[PDB]
């Protein structure tokens, strides 16, 4: 079944005077976290955060640990440089973030490689989707852009994104196939909430599903349009699955005319649900 992604989300936060920056890296395959590194652990190592990763041997962990430690110093240095670029005080804490990885189609073609940075919550510099040129968000990032074009770093990153990023994603999907290539279908039900003599709320719940992509609709008899349905953002259950709900306000006594429709990869067809007195 379909596309996949390998992503790393790396955060470095300076702590001037309180010593070295906080450096945290987390890796995800699709909607599932699988590794971390945190500089503040008493013995900072790259570590598994999904049980299927315990299949990788000690050489993998040692190598990855070393890579994290090299970037820890990269960010130490780059944080000090950005402080100077922006003429900021030496004492304040600032944040650099970096996101990199690959999105692949089901035949493993690269749909998009990423290698991208933010500073203090705004875009700083990003490898463009051509994997050859750079987009600077401001004039401080223009100085970085020039240094990276001079260094030819784009080609180093492209070679990773087109090659190794994809090869390792494949490996992880194989190591974690029982969970990463599974679906868990939503368990769904409708709840009924009295309010006034004219109105009630019906809430359509979907629980325990993987992956996170889901769509809930409400229909009145035929369908639904120009609609004021309340929705929450899809949220983690904490056990590797997700939750979502969608609610409508309807006239008292007309509840049986409304149907909830749940759409998810794990179902053999959309699920239709009603309020069941």
């Amino acid at each position: 079944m379909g596309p996949h992604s390998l992503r790393y989300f790396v955060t470095a936060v300076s702590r001037p005077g309180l010593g070295e920056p906080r450096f945290i890296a987390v890796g995800y395959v699709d909607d599932t976290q699988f590794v971390r590194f945190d500089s503040d652990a008493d013995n900072p190592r790259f570590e598994p955060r999904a049980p299927w990763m315990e299949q990788e041997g000690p050489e993998y962990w040692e190598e990855q640990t070393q890579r994290a430690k090299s970037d820890e110093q990269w960010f130490r240095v780059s944080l000090r440089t950005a402080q100077r670029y922006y003429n900021q005080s030496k004492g304040g804490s600032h944040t650099f973030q970096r996101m990199f990885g690959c999105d692949v189609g089901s035949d493993w073609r690269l749909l998009r490689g990423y290698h991208q940075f933010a500073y203090d919550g705004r875009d700083y510099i990003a490898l463009n989707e051509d994997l050859k040129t750079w987009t600077a968000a401001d004039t401080a990032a223009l100085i970085t852009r020039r240094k990276w074009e001079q260094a030819g770093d784009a080609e180093y990153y492209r070679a990773y994104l087109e090659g190794e990023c994809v090869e390792w994603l494949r490996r992880y999907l194989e190591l974690g196939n029982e969970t990463l290539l599974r679906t868990d279908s939503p368990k769904a039900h409708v709840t009924y909430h009295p309010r006034s003599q004219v109105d009630v709320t019906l809430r359509c719940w979907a629980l325990g599903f993987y992956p996170a992509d889901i769509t809930l609709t409400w229909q009145l008899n035929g369908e639904d349009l120009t609609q004021d349905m309340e929705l929450v953002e899809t949220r983690p259950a904490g056990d590797g699955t997700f939750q979502k709900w969608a609610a409508v306000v309807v006239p008292l006594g007309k509840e049986q005319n409304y149907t909830c429709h749940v759409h998810h990869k794990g179902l053999p067809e959309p699920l239709t649900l009603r309020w069941k007195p």
């Binding site: 790393y8 890296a25 890796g27 790259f46 990855q64 890579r67 994290a68 090299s70 970037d71 990269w74 240095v77 780059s78 440089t81 950005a82 670029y85 970096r98 990199f100 940075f117 700083y124 510099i125 970085t144 240094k147 990276w148 260094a151 770093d153 180093y156 990153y157 990773y160 190794e164 990023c165 390792w168």
Partner: peptide, 9 residues
């Protein structure tokens, strides 16, 4: 596979 950054900022 974590990929280290090259040139600094």
């Amino acid at each position: 596979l974590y990929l280290v950054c090259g040139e600094r900022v």
